[PDB]
Amino acid sequence: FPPEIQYELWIEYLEVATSHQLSPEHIRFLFEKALKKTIFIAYSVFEERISISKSIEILRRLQLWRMCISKAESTLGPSVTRELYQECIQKAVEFVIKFSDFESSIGAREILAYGAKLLPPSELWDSFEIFELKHGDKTYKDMLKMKKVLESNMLIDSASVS
């Protein structure tokens, strides 16, 4: 039936055959045959608890999909997740901001400058964010006023838009 009806077969066939078996290579191959969206998720769910990095490579191989990968990478530990966002950038800015928030926020200089690059990437809550980052220091009114100036310039480029 080819890639149309075959999917209608294949979703139940996967859910069932995975439910049955004891051996990685056979089912691995079966997903391989299979692959030609949810399939990635079943498959990834398999790899994490039988086959891990390989799975992460598979997820690496849309916003929701980006959100997942990041979750599984966090499951492998924190460090990757900040890394994941950089992949993520290329509404998404809200997510990159969501990752960057605890990134530099827990921190790193490349990450903070990235926070600036993202905040400037495209917003009053973000202004509260940068203001929070400035307030956190016991880092200067000058850079802060320059920041509000740049965001104002963004207000200018935004207002200039038709």
Binding site: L22, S23, P24, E25, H26, R28, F29, E32, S53, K54
Partner: protein
């Protein structure tokens, strides 16, 4: 029955997957070995040995050897070449010819993962495995290496095999908020006369050390009488030398309410509790909070 080529097509495609690098080829070694396991058995093991050795080189020592004992059943010279450090040779000479094929593989595993930061933890697990198989030969090796947090674990284990524990705990505490918590809990658990003696030569007084001396008096002098008078002396000596006494009035109010029950005793407890509240409320704390708030607002602007 007739799924033989199912394995042969999958295993050929698994090896057929190109692998540039060390970890990529070692990742493929995990795939085809599992395919070989489920389904020239010696030459596949030999080509697997060269792939793991020809890789990460740091992580292949734990990857290759972990599937060597299973590969051997389906060995002594190959393990010594891969594991190749001074303490590992000392561990081998004590339990190679004396005890095994389980022991001789476990020692090479200990020298692969360590050679470390987890040396006091691994050495404590080595003595627990060697002694079990209340031994005085392995415990003395730990006691000899103690003189040259982690030592309290080996001290509490050797004593269990509180008469001999005082000999080890005195040496441990002689040489960290967690380190003193282990020595304080050991001298308190051993016991009510010696529990108070250990409290006097440790608790001294701190917010944890002062709170520990109060908890020691609750358990040690619980079934005796003079818990209120001794607790009032500790809070007075601590407050004078060292606003943050909300846990002393709260733990004392819960200790009085938790006591099993009269009228004259309960009314006397209300008089004693209210006397501390009246004396506490008239000692500079709602007034102290607003004072620092005005200074904090003034300091900024």
């Amino acid at each position: 029955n007739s799924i033989e080529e199912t394995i042969s097509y999958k295993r050929k495609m698994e090896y057929e997957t190109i692998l540039s690098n060390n970890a990529y080829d070692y990742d493929t070694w995990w795939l085809y070995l599992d395919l070989i396991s489920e389904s020239q058995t010696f030459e596949k093991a030999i080509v697997d040995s060269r792939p793991k050795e020809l890789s990460n080189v740091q992580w292949k020592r734990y990857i290759y050897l972990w599937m060597r004992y299973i590969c051997y059943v389906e060995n002594s010279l190959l393990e010594e070449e891969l594991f190749q450090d001074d303490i590992i040779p000392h561990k081998h000479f004590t339990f190679s010819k004396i005890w095994m094929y389980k022991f001789l593989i476990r020692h090479d595993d200990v020298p692969k993962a360590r050679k470390l930061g987890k040396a006091i933890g691994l050495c404590p697990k080595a003595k627990t495995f060697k002694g079990y198989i209340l031994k005085e030969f392995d415990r003395v090796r730990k006691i000899y290496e103690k003189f040259i947090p982690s030592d309290l674990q080996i001290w509490s284990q050797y004593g269990e095999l509180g008469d001999w524990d005082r000999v080890r705990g005195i040496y441990t505490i002689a040489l960290s908020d967690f380190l003193t918590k282990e020595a304080k809990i050991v001298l308190l658990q051993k016991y009510t006369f010696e529990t108070e003696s250990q409290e006097f030569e440790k608790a001294r007084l701190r917010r944890l050390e002062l709170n520990q001396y109060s908890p020691q008096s609750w358990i040690e002098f619980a079934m005796y009488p003079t818990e209120q008078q001794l607790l009032d002396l500790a809070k007075l000596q601590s407050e004078n030398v060292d606003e943050f006494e909300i846990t002393d009035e709260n733990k004392l109010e819960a200790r009085k309410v938790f006591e099993e029950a009269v009228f004259f005793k309960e009314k006397d407890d209300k008089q004693g509790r209210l006397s501390i509240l009246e004396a506490l409320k008239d000692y500079e704390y709602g007034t102290e909070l607003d004072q620092e708030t005005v200074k904090k607002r003034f300091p900024k602007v």
